[PDB]
Amino acid sequence: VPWFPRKVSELDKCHHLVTKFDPDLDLDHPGFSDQVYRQRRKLIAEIAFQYRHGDPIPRVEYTAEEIATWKEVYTTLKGLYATHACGEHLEAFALLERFSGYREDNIPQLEDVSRFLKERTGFQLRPVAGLLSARDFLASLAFRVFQCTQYIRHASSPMHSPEPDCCHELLGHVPMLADRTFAQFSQDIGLASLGASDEEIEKLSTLYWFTVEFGLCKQNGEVKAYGAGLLSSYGELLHCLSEEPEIRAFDPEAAAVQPYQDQTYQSVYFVSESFSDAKDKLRSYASRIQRPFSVKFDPYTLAIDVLDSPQAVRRSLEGVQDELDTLAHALSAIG
Amino acid sequence: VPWFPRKVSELDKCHHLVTKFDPDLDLDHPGFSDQVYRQRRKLIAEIAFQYRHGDPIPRVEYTAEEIATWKEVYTTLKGLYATHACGEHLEAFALLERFSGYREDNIPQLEDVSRFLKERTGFQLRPVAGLLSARDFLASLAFRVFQCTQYIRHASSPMHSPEPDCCHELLGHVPMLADRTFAQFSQDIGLASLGASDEEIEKLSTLYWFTVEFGLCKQNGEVKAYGAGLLSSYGELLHCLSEEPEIRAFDPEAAAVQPYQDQTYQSVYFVSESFSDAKDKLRSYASRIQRPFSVKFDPYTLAIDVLDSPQAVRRSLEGVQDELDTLAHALSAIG
Amino acid sequence: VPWFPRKVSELDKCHHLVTKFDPDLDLDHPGFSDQVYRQRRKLIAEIAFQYRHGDPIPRVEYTAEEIATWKEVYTTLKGLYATHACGEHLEAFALLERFSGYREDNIPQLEDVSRFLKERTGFQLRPVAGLLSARDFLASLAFRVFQCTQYIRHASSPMHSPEPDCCHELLGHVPMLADRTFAQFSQDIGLASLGASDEEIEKLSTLYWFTVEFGLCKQNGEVKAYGAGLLSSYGELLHCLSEEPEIRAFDPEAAAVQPYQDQTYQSVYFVSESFSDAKDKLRSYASRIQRPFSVKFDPYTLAIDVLDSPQAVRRSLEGVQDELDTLAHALSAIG
Amino acid sequence: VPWFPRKVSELDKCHHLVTKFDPDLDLDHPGFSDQVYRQRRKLIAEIAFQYRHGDPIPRVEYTAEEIATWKEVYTTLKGLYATHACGEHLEAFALLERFSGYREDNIPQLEDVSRFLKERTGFQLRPVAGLLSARDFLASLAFRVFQCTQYIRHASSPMHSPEPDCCHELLGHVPMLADRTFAQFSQDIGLASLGASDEEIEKLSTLYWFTVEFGLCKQNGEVKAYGAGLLSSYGELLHCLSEEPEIRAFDPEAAAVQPYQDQTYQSVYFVSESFSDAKDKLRSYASRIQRPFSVKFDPYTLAIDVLDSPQAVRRSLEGVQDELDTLAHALSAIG
Ligand SMILES: [Fe+3]
Ligand SMILES: [Fe+3]
Ligand SMILES: [Fe+3]
Ligand SMILES: [Fe+3]
């Protein structure tokens, strides 16, 4: 049986011995002349090392050379939201320009966007250095905890980034995460990954690559993009509605074993009619995932309840009935 | 219509113009020769002033004269947990001696005990100076937020305290709050106080006085105490099972308009068979609480969904069916 | 594990193999000089001989003396329904008098009152001569099917009957069965009795003796009677609220093993605050009833679902999800 | 507001002043030389006139020539069930050949097949002469009551029938109605027609024409037919899988206003992936149907609860938790 966390406190200690105190190279593209950026890459990874859950995100000081490229990705891509982007993202980004502080000059710290996501849907961002485990990033996302990075792509590559940075996720991930039914859907991707096998971790990350990271929506009839990495780079948002890639309909099995690269612009895409339809289709795929149990996210204590017994489903079922009797008493109150 | 909070971010700004920047006197008993304790009372009042939600509780430095009285209330009342105290409190206090850091010499800081309650039930302790509003302390309690006071009673009164301190709540309130059934019960007391009138606030606070603050339980046949203030003082825990006060059965309306004082050891007590019997009896009382709506705690975003329409109950009921479809897909998985 | 029916057609064969084609004597009191009444009992018994489920009840002919003692029990007991009887039974009796055909001169046949119960709550009266198995009558009452006797007590004993007749059941059982929550209550006793062992069958029939057959209610503060046999005989309805019997509170375990006779007017009675509270106490008793499975009454096909696996509870919960999506769409429709 | 029934007893009273005591002609094709068949059509039309609910179906005598065309349709169409027909029908027709009494020589009476539908899903066949109101046949279907015709098409036209006969519905309708999901699905079509406007009756009947009467399924990958009239006539069952008609995908609104004829083999068909997917897609279409309320089928009393208030939704919701606490105590029983 593969391992999965139980509390958000247990999310740290068993996912830092595998993901942290690791001396990482600069980028997988080997060798940069960016040593003062590498020390900026080294200090930015050391914030997530001593960070434990419940402690706040320590704020990041920024020099102007990554602020100006944060400005360069801002003024390009915010103008690129009227082009080909999801309309749910447009109202979410308008909320992020008022609440979080999405601007050209000031890059928002990870705390104030985390305080935004707890007030909208209850997600929180979690600072982490690497994407080094595909399981642990998915196992955290079940806890309504999005693993996020605190670094920026380099000024030499301001448009295409081979690794997810704050320009990737604060503009691509978390404006989708401010949606309610997407955040329940993106969690149920991670809710299927607890104790899931390594090919199921791969299949869910194959699924996660094509309906959250790089996924195309359909709002008001017209097809728009809602993927995180689609709304993170310059030409790919122009590429997804362009027709030299092909857009399949979103299927569970076709997104389970889909081949994918990470460097050039992706060929296969998955059109999703709505975030709820992605949630209904993840309900079909998470059922057939073979597992000796299943898990329910217990959102009061923000934990995971293993349903490895009929008795465990019962103490979840009264957790439904204590708030369904709330609905039974609310329908008496209103009227 | 009275005012009630909507988010935990809105819990601070509309409950500090009414409860904070108030220059408080030392104690309601007028006149102490405790000026170096009054500046200690003043600095412990100002830590909650600029405290905003989402920020952690800053740690408190302690001089030895309140350490020794924290040591005095510890070695007496932990010895008084075999006598007349709840067994559900007893295993909880055993968890509080291991996880939170309860001992003789060091008083546990508020961050470590609040991070404990995130792991158990999802309550959090929130630092506040005064008990200045009886509505807002109940209005925060629906948000799974317990208003708590970071000061200590004076060394001249080590046993009886006229005001709730850390010796009141960190030994009386929180080890009840770590129970799952009592936390849902104590929140439903606060869930009736949202938008409720001032005599309904007073009816609920008289109810809160007799089934959370001073409430007596019944485990293993014998009657024990589970009240917060009962498990907070020297002689009162020996007084509640004594027969010179009378213990009534816990009733919805006979706890609503029950008279109460605060100085003398209390006469009337309310025996509760279990916390679930306290929960279903609050379900009967909060139903008849007259209100233009009812409110439901949204445990994902830690907020309140006001159900003032049939449409508002639906967007809760979609959250119930997405919760139940997790359960139906779990019962397919287990078996 | 003993035997219990699954379909309503399987209420017939395995409960007529043990309770039918039995040569029955006239009364358990030894010896009547009433051979024409014996032929009446024999013909009434062979009405239920070839009766299968889905067939209507064949109408019963009545001569002058059973019509006259029906008039006697009707004009005594309807006049006594103002005396110490349930007001819910009073309004249900008014509904029976305008709907089913309750009058002094004509005794109502079983078909019209059965069509009334399928109109109100969905019970059906089902003709059978003897109560020969205490297990099978309860296991029928699981199916919302009340086994019922199509004969009349003796004319020389118009007030006290040693056996349940139409003057017993049509006066005491069926106007309680037309109530919603008491029907769901009395169905849950048989739902507890499905596949239960012999001393569990004895305990559940013993409970049924004290909360359906002879059970006492409390409406508007005042104690009244709602039991079947209490509201079936003349002197017992005035005896039960007299003080020479003792009335304990309704308890799940103290009604399970409570001793009882049947000839003398009963000593111990069980006051119930409401039929809903009786339903909660039967829920708490039926929880602790030891059984390798449970059963859910599926009221669409009127059948019984064994929950002996999490898969069975899943395909039970899917119908709950259809009927709750019905409510979630209804709350969108209304507003 | 249009009129809708409330009980199954009230289903007869206000759907016989509008559909019964009307002298109907032989066929809509004007003029047959079939006077002794017209009296056979008349006596079948008069068996439904004095029919009431709860009163069972009286048996129908059959002479040779309606048996001889029942001989003809049973040899041809049962051979046409391995070809192009739904496999869920095939196991149901095998269930219908065993239980109901389906054979070549004896046309089964309506009582033995209606006793089967109460045994599987809880539907019942209700004898009626004409389909004269498209609302009332839909308004009955919400009650799990299928309006059905106890006559047979003439021997001169034994393969194509201009009107639904016993060969239409006992081979087409009821072996679909024995499915658990389809009976819930076909009721939800009728559940949208309560108090619905005449264009909504027409929109539902055009919907009912294309997903129950003439609807094509997709079982095990291959496309098969599950429509009632498709599995009722000779050449149409080979026509629907043929390619000179076109089979659209089943849609909510494209089935609502879809034009249709009745004489020529139908052009447009609606492929449905499963009966549950048709139930999900009727959940989407009947949601957007404008109505002053919605209706819930209360399957205990076999009646309809009109949900024109939040209070009416609440007395449904206590029915949910009453059988959810059944499920909550079942998950404790099993384990
Ligand atoms: Fe990302
Ligand atoms: Fe307190
Ligand atoms: Fe009886
Ligand atoms: Fe038809």
Numbering used by the authors:
A (entry chain D), B (entry chain A), C (entry chain B), D (entry chain C): 163 to 497
Give passages from the manuscript:
The central structure was also subjected to a further refinement by masking out the RDs, and the final resolution reached 3.4 Å. In the 3D reconstruction, many structural features could be assigned to α-helices and loops in the central structure formed by CD and OD domains, in particular the α-helices involved in tetramerization. The four subunits of this central structure have an asymmetric arrangement that could be explained by the tetramer being formed by a dimer of dimers. The comparative analysis showed differences in the region encompassing residues 176–196: whereas the Cryo-EM model revealed a helical and loop structure arrangement, the crystallographic structure shows only a loop that is shifted from the former. This difference could be ascribed to contacts established by this flexible loop in the crystallographic arrangement. However, while the resolution in most of the TH core ranges from 2 to 4 Å, it was only about 5 Å in PAH. There were also differences in the CD that have to do with its arrangement relative to the central OD, with a 12.7° outward tilt of the CD in TH compared with that of PAH (left). In the active, apo and non-phospho state, the 39−58 α-helix of TH is detached from the main structure (I, apo-TH).
